[PDB]
Amino acid sequence: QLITVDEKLDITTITGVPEEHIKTRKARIFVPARNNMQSGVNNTKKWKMEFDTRERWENPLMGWASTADPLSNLVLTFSTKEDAVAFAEKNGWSYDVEERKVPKPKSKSYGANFSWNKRTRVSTK
Amino acid sequence: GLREIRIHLCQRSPGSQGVRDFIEKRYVELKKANPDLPILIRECSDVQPKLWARYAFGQEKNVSLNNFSADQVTRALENVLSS
Amino acid sequence: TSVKPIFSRDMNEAKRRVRELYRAWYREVPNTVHLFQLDISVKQGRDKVREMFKKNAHITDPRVVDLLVIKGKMELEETIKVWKQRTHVMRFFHETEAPRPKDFLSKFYVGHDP
Amino acid sequence: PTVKPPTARKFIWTNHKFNLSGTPQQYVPYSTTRKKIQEWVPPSTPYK
Amino acid sequence: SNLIEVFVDGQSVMVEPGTTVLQACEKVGMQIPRFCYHERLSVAGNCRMCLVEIEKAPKVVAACAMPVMKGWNILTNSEKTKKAREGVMEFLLANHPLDCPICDQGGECDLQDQSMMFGSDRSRFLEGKRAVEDKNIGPLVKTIMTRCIQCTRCIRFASEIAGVDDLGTTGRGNDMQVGTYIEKMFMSELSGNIIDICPVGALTSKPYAFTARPWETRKTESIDVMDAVGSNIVVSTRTGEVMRILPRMHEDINEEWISDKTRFAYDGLKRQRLTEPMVRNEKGLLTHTTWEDALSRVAGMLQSFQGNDVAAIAGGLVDAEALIALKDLLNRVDSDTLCTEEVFPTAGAGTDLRSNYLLNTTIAGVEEADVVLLVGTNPRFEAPLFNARIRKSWLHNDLKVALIGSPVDLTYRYDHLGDSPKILQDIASGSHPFSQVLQEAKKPMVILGSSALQRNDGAAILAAVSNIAQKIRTSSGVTGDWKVMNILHRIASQVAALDLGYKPGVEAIQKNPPKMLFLLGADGGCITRQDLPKDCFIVYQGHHGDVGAPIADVILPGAAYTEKSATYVNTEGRAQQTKVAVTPPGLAREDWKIIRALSEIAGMTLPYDTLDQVRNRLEEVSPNLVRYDDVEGANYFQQASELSKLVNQQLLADPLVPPQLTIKDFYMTDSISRASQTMAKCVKAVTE
Amino acid sequence: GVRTSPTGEKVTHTGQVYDDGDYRKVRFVGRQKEVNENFAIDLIAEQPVSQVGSRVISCDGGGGALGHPRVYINLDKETKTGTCGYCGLQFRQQH
Amino acid sequence: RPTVRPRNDVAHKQLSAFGEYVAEILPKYVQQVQVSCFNELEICIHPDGVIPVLTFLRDHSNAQFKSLADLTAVDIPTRQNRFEIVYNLLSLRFNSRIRVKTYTDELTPIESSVPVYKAANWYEREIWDMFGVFFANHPDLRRILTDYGFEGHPFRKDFPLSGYVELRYDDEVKRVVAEPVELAQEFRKFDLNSPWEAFPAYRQPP
Amino acid sequence: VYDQVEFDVPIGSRGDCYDRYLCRVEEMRQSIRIISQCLNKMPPGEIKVDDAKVSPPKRAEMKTSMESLIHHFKLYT
Amino acid sequence: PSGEERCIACKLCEAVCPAQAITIEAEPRADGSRRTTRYDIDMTKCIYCGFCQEACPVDAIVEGPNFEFSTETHEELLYNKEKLLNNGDKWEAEIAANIQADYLYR
Ligand code: SF4
Ligand code: SF4
Ligand code: SF4
Ligand code: SF4
Ligand code: FES
Ligand SMILES: [K+]
Ligand SMILES: [Zn+2]
Secondary structure, three states, rough: OOEEEOOOOOOOOOOOOHHHHHHEEEEEOEEEEEEEOOOHHHOOEEEEEEOOOOOOOEOOOOOEEEEOOOOOOOOOEEEOHHHHHHHHHHHOEEEOOOOOOOOOEEEEEEEEHHOOOOOOOOOOO | EEEEEEEEOOOHHHHHHHHHHHHHHHHHHHHHHHOOOEEEEEOOOOOOOEEEEEEEEHHHHEOOOOOHHHHHHHHHHHHHHHH | OEEOOOOOHHHHHHHHHHHHHHHHHHHHHHHHHHHOOOOHHHHHHHHHHHHHHOOOOOOOOOHHHHHHHHOOOOOOOHHHHOOOHHHHOOOOOOOOOOOOOOOHHHHHHHOOOO | OOOOOOOOOOOOOOOOOOOOOOOOOOOOOOOOOOOOOOOOOOOHHHHH | OOOOOEEEEOOOEEOOOOOEHHHHHHOOOOOOOOOOOOOOOOOOOOOOOEEEOOOOOOEEEOOOOOOOOOOEEEEEEHHHHHHHHHHHHHHHHHHHOOOOOOOOOOOOOOHHHHHHHOOOOOOOEEEOOOOOOOOOOOEEEEEEEOOOOOHHHHHHHHHOOOOOOOOEEOOOOOHEEOOOOOOOOOOOOOOOHHHOOOOOEEEEOOOOOOOOOHHHHHHHHHEEEOOHHHHHHHHEEEEEEEEEEEEOOOOOOOOOOOOHHHHHHHHHHOOEOOOOOOOOOOOOEEEEOHHHHHHHHHHHHHOOOHHHHHHEEOOOHHHHHHHHHHHHHOOOOOOOOOOEOOOOOOOOOOOEEEOOOEOOOOOOHHHHEEEOOOOOOHHHHOOOHHHHHHHHHHOOOEEEEEOOOOOOOOOOOEEEEEEEHHHHHHHHHOOOOOHHHHHHHOOOOEEEEEEEOOOOHHHHHHHHHHHHHHHHOOOOOOOOOOEEEEEOOOOHHHHHHHEEEEEEEEHHHOOOOOEEEEEOOOOOOOOOHHHOOOOEEEEEEEEEEOOEEEEEEEEOOOOOOOOOOOEEEOOOEEEEEEEOOOOOOOOOOOOOHHHHHHHHHHOOOOOOOOOOOHHHHHHHOOOHHHOOOOOOOOOHHHHHHHHHHOOOOOOOOOEEEEEEOHHHHHOOOOOOHOHHHHHHHHHHOOOO | EEOOOOOOEEEOOOOOOOOOHHHHHHHHOOOOOOOOOHHHHHHHHHHEEEEEEEEEEEEOOOOOHOOOEEEEEOOOOOOEEEEEEOOOOOEOOOO | OOOOOOOOOHHHHHHHHHHHHHHHHOOOOEEEHHHHHOEEEEEEOOOOHHHHHHHHHHHHOOOOOEEEEEEEEEEEEOOOOOOOEEEEEEEOOOOEEEEEEEOOOOOEEOOOOOOOOHHHHHHHHHHHHHOOOOEEOOOOOOOOOOOOOOOOOOOOOOOOOOOOOEEEEOOOOOOOEEEEEEEOOOOOOOOOOOOOOOOHHOOOOO | OOOHHOOOOOOOOOOHHHHHHHHHHHHHHHHHHHHHHHHOOOOOOOOOOOOOOOOOOOHHHHHOHHHHHHHHHHHOO | OOOOOOOOOOOOHHHHHHOOOEEEEEEEEOOOOOEEEEEEEEOOOOOOOOOHHHOOOOOOOOOOOOOOOOOOOOOHEEEEEEHHHHHHHHHHHHHHHHHHHHHOOO
């Protein structure tokens, strides 16, 4: 048998996350920008969720980077922006969504390198 | 007394039509009569038109202008200047 | 909006399970303070139990309430059967954690965290 | 090593040392990098 | 209707005529391997890594250059295509040096990665390798040219994007070499971009050298504040340290480029930093103190002054959250003297109408214009990525560009109308023959530089340029939705401050000198203690000790733009926000929090306690300030033009001379870049 | 190239040394600061420049497969020497 | 071809045929059947079918999957039902293996399979402990791996690697105490994925 | 290569600790039996798959061949 | 053999390290050479797996033959570059001979 439940899906009280790391965090939902050092686009297919960056300090003994943020490395992957938004909602995280940036179609033409009267003529190859 | 006026409105929504008409026809005169009063006009898509009046020591009051006509907008601005 | 229930079919039935769990916890505190040789009073133990229930007062999903009770029963089983040790029981009281500042100014002075 | 001696290098320790833990010659770790952020130094002369 | 059908591995796709095979493939999510092809450069077709089989065609075609014909079936994974890639990869690696461990490209190298995905797994090259001598092209780009694969991306970028024909190929055959032939520095405001486009480690960042590997850096997507273009960037950090700055593609702003200042001034974030609150001691020297003590000193002085006795000046890198917090705080002592260092004429509408001080056409609108009139500006150095967008239009749309001002080099030929501000009246009257160019143009664009408005006759210049844009619309020759008038800002914080209602310039402070002055990152030296009463209490809030700090009574260490999530509005009026890459150093704090904390100690607590709440406040003042990445149009140019005529101010006879005339003036323009050792090397390099 | 600071603490080959007011040097009290005395930067500088009779030489660091990846060094410039990017050995084209 | 794993078409056909066999007999519950290129048969079922489908595979004369090799869960946050429940079964009679998969979310119980396989007892406790999936009618559902009083379910993708609390001995209270976790060296996140596609055969339509 | 070696599987009859003890002892004996065959039937050849996109190349190859160095770099990062 | 460090701060050891026991920082040396300014191994994180010496392209980092280096304090097992270079100078005579005997298997 199925019951009827109309309330918003909320699991904040049964996930075990401490209150400070639910209410004070800010999740960022976005498609990672292409690393401009490379032309590959395979790391721009999926949506991501990261959290706000928090303090890192130098360990007195070694100089290592210490942290007290338990979410500093947490990065989730989602197929769509809707899935990422849904996951943030039920976990109680406030979030910002950035719309995916698509490279717009270019009009490429090799023959334009040799134009008779336009500035697109190249001076070298 | 009065320190600043802000008028928020949309560029396209019909609810801001009266505010749009007021600016188009009567803001120039209002600014001539009030040379040194900041009247910040700030358009933003899909916002409810609103009037903000800031007074001395940071006191602020706002009046909604949704669906007002150009005359009602004048009247709403009439109240603020006297206040 | 049809979902499979856990135990309760609505909030009224879920609330009955909550009150049974609260009664079981309330009655077990005097034994826990004695068996575990705690340095807290029975009042403190029961005040802590009441605090833990209260923070979950806003739930309106009977399924969520069901899970909270399920976990509450497991926590009570670990305590009654002495699977927990003294350290586990006292972890509810954060006795070595110096209070974090709450007002804006105190948090502003010490660091960057909101 | 009396029959196949090790290859000699100038930087190889000529004097072996045994485990020095617990003595004043024990190793003490420390960061080998220099300071990263340089603070602004206010002027020495007065001028407010 | 014009679309034609082609097949990618049997999958049908509809494409516009002229689409290349490579572009047809990406429409079904296939990325053909490439080296020489870049979609923002002219097609070259020389690396041959993009060769692909066409079903029923014996010869493979270069996908990047071959236009796709109707009915073609592109076999992106056939045996012939795979063997073509393996062959080309083999030739690319035959002479390539075994450098990956010492090469900075390692880990983010397109040669490494496409070798792994599309090449063989071993070598059969049994000969010795080519070795090439290195070329010195300045202090920013390191060259290890034995790594070069002769893709000519750098040559094409330099000629096409940067408009500098100093790079080329010398020699022939296997010994063909990329360089300048003669010893010569490639110093351009866009030069650092050849590092990104070079697919190998042939061109690398000199400041970045050897410091990090790509897999270990954390990427923070943020905004540049070195100018008012709002270039989108990524801040690479590792173990709490900023390591480099990279472009982030935003087609409507910086497409995928950044200026050399945006790229390389980050090292100034590690020098001359304010890390602790300071107060003057008995001897009149700044000495470190606690936050409690420093704010108590400021709160006491704040509580004893009212009205015009309190003023504030906002600097060039201030964010909107701090701008409104400071405005709210002085308003609660009934002070309205909230000033910016950068002047904007208050004549007529002033900052009443956003359209008076925005780049109304938008940066992307440049590509739609047919005539551009530049007035009293050098966009090459004021807005390098805006100037690059002009050259793109000049190159591809045959854009006609005219300049009134000094005859600076803009990297493209333009019609110089002169430097006298009188030419504006000639154009408006119709006497000047360029007025006939504007009259015919269907989409003219008149751009006035904010740097010209810093003149005393700025109100006259704005009125004169406004009059021209008014006649162009009176001719009715423009579409209607098209906007003609544009202001080009150079300061990141200027547009947000005008939106919030600040007073442009510091004229008000000079008129009524205050007894207490807040310097919020102000380092322009516009107001000094010579302009203030002898006992003026100066509070400096900022991240660098530069010009403002040494004169302050109290120093409050703020956060730099890499250390806070803060709102900036670019010259178009587009609101963007940064993200925290690293936290502020030492005891430094987020700027809007300092003012919020100060307000509580002074018994004037501001009504917001979190970032979200201060941004709710920003929405109450100017709703567009929280519409991130959106460009909200501004209207009512007619109303502004009517008011601009009400008061007549004469034009000064001085010629219009931009503050930055040559590349040497470009590198240092703010506290961060003035503290950068890299920018100092660039300045030394181009002046010597 | 080991030197001491005004405090007498030895400076490392990476230039590290605690300054006068740094409390962290208390860790060395009653013990010692580990410092390696063979500065590689000075040892490599002592190696002589190798004179070769070709425009391009190769270096693998010596020992064949026990050295480093084999690289080819261009010697066209007479202004300076060709330096191996791996081991620091220097080469010069003769006359 | 020495370096390429050889295919086995005989096993691929047999498993495919048995996959159809199972789906014809239990249409009420089977949602998908697939055989991998290395010849593993997966039955995807509606969660209601757990007991009937497992009972059929254990008891039916052409199945006789008498051994439960493993029972585990996978957390996939992008899915509406984030938890995938996986049963790996072994049939000694037919020298064959089969995998049965279903799904659930945080608040939806799954029927305990202890009645079918007694081996399921501890596996379901482990799934409850590590993932927080509740199994209905379990003879004794409680944590099995985590410390007593441990909060959260560590194997969820959104649970941090180092958790939220760490332990130490405190002399003032003379016991082990739990405190919020601070690390002298933060775990260094690596971005290792190449931006170039590796496997065209798995490309997802755009 | 377990299909290429001969050995017996010890089987118990009572399903108790003593029989499982005997099975383990007998499995040790069969392990020696298998080890004897492995030593005699050990073939020559390479020890890891000759596919440098999976198994790293030999160190000598890594230091001479451009492809090998790339693949070594990528497999270890 | 000249005394120049073999390590070129490529960071392949740090990347492969299964325990993240290696921490490296690097910059151009005064003579322009690519060298580390930090090379730490937390010997209490390390699992002594040898992956670092497999990954190294120049035989710079090795696991040597010494197994008798137990200490009285935890801090003594947090090795920095000076300690590791001293270990190389201390043990090179043996390390080189062991590499000589096994490199043809690598
Ligand atoms: S450019 Fe790429 S392949 Fe060439 S040495 Fe550098 S990392 Fe290796
Ligand atoms: S230097 Fe780089 S971008 Fe220029 S031709 Fe060579 S590989 Fe291409
Ligand atoms: S031996 Fe130690 S330092 Fe080297 S890779 Fe293994 S765990 Fe890391
Ligand atoms: S020890 Fe070897 S692998 Fe590690 S950074 Fe140095 S050269 Fe690279
Ligand atoms: S990418 Fe087509 S030939 Fe270079
Ligand atoms: K490059
Ligand atoms: Zn060498």
